[PDB]
Design an enzyme around this catalytic site. Structure first.
Site, PDB file in Angstrom:
ATOM      1  N   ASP B 153       0.820  -1.233  -0.024  1.00 37.87           N
ATOM      2  CA  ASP B 153      -0.038  -0.016  -0.135  1.00 37.87           C
ATOM      3  C   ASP B 153       0.864   1.219   0.050  1.00 37.87           C
ATOM      4  OD1 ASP B 153      -2.858   1.312   1.802  1.00 37.87           O
ATOM      5  OD2 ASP B 153      -2.662   1.456  -0.225  1.00 37.87           O
ATOM      6  N   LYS B 155       1.863   4.754  -0.726  1.00 37.01           N
ATOM      7  CA  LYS B 155       1.159   6.180  -1.234  1.00 37.01           C
ATOM      8  C   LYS B 155       1.709   7.243  -0.467  1.00 37.01           C
ATOM      9  CE  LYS B 155      -3.252   4.822   0.323  1.00 37.01           C
ATOM     10  NZ  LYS B 155      -4.510   4.315  -0.136  1.00 37.01           N
ATOM     11  N   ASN B 158       0.062   7.246   3.070  1.00 37.77           N
ATOM     12  CA  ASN B 158       0.750   6.204   4.021  1.00 37.77           C
ATOM     13  C   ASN B 158       2.077   6.615   4.345  1.00 37.77           C
ATOM     14  OD1 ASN B 158      -1.793   4.826   3.962  1.00 37.77           O
ATOM     15  ND2 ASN B 158      -1.216   3.277   2.825  1.00 37.77           N
ATOM     16  N   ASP B 171       0.592   2.178   8.031  1.00 40.11           N
ATOM     17  CA  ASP B 171      -0.348   1.484   7.294  1.00 40.11           C
ATOM     18  C   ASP B 171      -0.090   0.043   6.896  1.00 40.11           C
ATOM     19  OD1 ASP B 171      -2.859   0.446   6.261  1.00 40.11           O
ATOM     20  OD2 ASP B 171      -3.384   2.118   5.156  1.00 40.11           O
ATOM     21  N   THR B 188      -4.070   0.744  -3.902  1.00 38.81           N
ATOM     22  CA  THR B 188      -4.720   2.046  -4.441  1.00 38.81           C
ATOM     23  C   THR B 188      -4.771   1.990  -5.770  1.00 38.81           C
ATOM     24  OG1 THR B 188      -3.816   2.928  -2.097  1.00 38.81           O
ATOM     25  CG2 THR B 188      -4.329   4.328  -4.033  1.00 38.81           C
TER      26      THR B 188
HETATM   27 MG   LIG Z   1      -5.158   0.359   5.353  1.00 35.47          MG
HETATM   28 MG   LIG Z   2      -3.899   4.529   4.847  1.00 36.14          MG
END
Ligand SMILES: [Mg+2]
Ligand SMILES: [Mg+2]
Ligand SMILES: Nc1ncnc2c1ncn2[C@@H]1O[C@H](COP(=O)(O)OP(=O)(O)NP(=O)(O)O)[C@@H](O)[C@H]1O
Lengths: 19, 337
Positions: B153, B155, B158, B171, B188
């Site tokens: 994840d 990005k 985060n 995260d 994402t």
């Molecule tokens: Mg999450």
């Molecule tokens: Mg997040």
């Protein structure tokens, strides 16, 4: 410009994760 | 040496992975102050630990919401992994616990705000500024993958900026310890590797793809693939075409062609050399990898801090009642939390 296109787009805010 | 460091790193991790810490605080040991951010199953709040006086970031996850969304395994993954890792650019889990209604993960509070907020306000980062952040991500991915972890994840949302202007990755909601390939469609839309979208099995190479998107977005101010609907983003990702801003240097563009490489056999981070393909790339020539790790490089910017418990670097969110049921919800599902 692609920057102007981005700024006008609906995805300039915080993006949710998907699952 | 790197090899010996990773060996000691793996052993520390494995001990905590095999024997996770549990129920190391409770809700009434904290004053809840302000929401710092939101996600799918709830809230991250600024809290104050009454006994020590420390501020922390408490992540609150609604058990019932986790179950309804079928996120049980991801959430157990998230807590098991985050309590077991230790690296300078990973947010420290301090306490975890649960009650009748919620799961709680109390982290060190990273006051600098999301990279997202700074990036959108400023427009874009200069190449040396983006490199500084990217370097920390590279080392962090080296660490995580050596532990058989896939992060999944990456990005700006985060990524948090600490008081020294350094990255803290938060995260771990989609993180997973996996030795083979895996298949869950998660992440994402903008950051998804083609192989995720195409419902192929995938592996840790998706993180290296996500690094390419991140660097591109930091350096351009917009991601390499955007559109108003997720489905339209996926078509762009799959198509194997990326356009670069004319202000991107030749080294940057070359690094990005290798990271945003559709063919897994050609993607940097995934070849025989592994991470060294990236560390030794020309774009990173000026990077002192050891100095980055020891946090001895001066940051491109230190965030503003009006003192302890200051939330000026975070957006405001609608506060809501924190309600704890008198009946234990989903006790069996979250036993190991
Ligand atoms: Mg999450
Ligand atoms: Mg997040
Ligand atoms: N350790 C932390 N310190 C300060 N803010 C944080 C911290 N962790 C999370 N946040 C904020 O809360 C948001 C959501 O946290 P995250 O861990 O990303 O949960 P999510 O809902 O799965 N997405 C982040 O984007 C940050 O803005």
């Amino acid at each position: 410009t692609t920057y102007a296109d981005f700024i006008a787009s609906g995805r300039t805010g915080r993006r949710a994760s998907i699952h | 040496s790197v090899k010996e460091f990773l060996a000691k790193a793996k052993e520390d991790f494995l001990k905590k992975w095999e024997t996770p810490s549990q129920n190391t605080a409770q809700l009434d040991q904290f004053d809840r102050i302000k929401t710092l951010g939101t996600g799918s199953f709830g809230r991250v709040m600024l809290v104050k630990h009454k006994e020590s006086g420390n501020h922390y970031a408490m992540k609150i996850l609604d058990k019932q919401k986790v179950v309804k969304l079928k996120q049980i395994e991801h959430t157990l993954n998230e807590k098991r992994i985050l309590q077991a890792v230790n690296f300078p650019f990973l947010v420290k889990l301090e306490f975890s616990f649960k009650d009748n209604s919620n799961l709680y993960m109390v982290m060190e509070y990273v006051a600098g705000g999301e990279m997202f907020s700074h990036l959108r306000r400023i427009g874009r980062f200069s190449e040396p500024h983006a490199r500084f952040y990217a370097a920390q991500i590279v080392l962090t991915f080296e660490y995580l993958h050596s532990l058989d972890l896939i992060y999944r994840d990456l990005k700006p949302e985060n990524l948090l900026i600490d008081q020294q202007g350094y990255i803290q990755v938060t995260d771990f909601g989609f993180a997973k310890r996996v030795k083979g390939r895996t298949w869950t469609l998660c992440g994402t839309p903008e950051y998804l590797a083609p192989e995720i979208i195409l419902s192929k099995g995938y592996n840790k190479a998706v993180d290296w793809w996500a690094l390419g998107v991140l660097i591109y977005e930091m350096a351009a101010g917009y991601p390499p693939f955007f559109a108003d609907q997720p489905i339209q983003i996926y078509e762009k990702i799959v198509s194997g075409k990326v356009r670069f801003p004319s202000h991107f240097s030749s080294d940057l563009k070359d690094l990005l062609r290798n990271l945003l490489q559709v063919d897994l056999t050609k993607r940097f981070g995934n070849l025989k050399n592994g991470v060294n393909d990236i560390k030794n790339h020309k774009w990173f020539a000026t990077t002192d990898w050891i100095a980055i790790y020891q946090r001895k490089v001066e940051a491109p910017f230190i965030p503003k801090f009006k003192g302890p418990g200051d939330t000026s670097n975070f957006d405001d969110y609608e506060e809501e009642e924190i309600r704890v049921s008198i009946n234990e919800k989903c006790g069996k599902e979250f036993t190991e939390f």
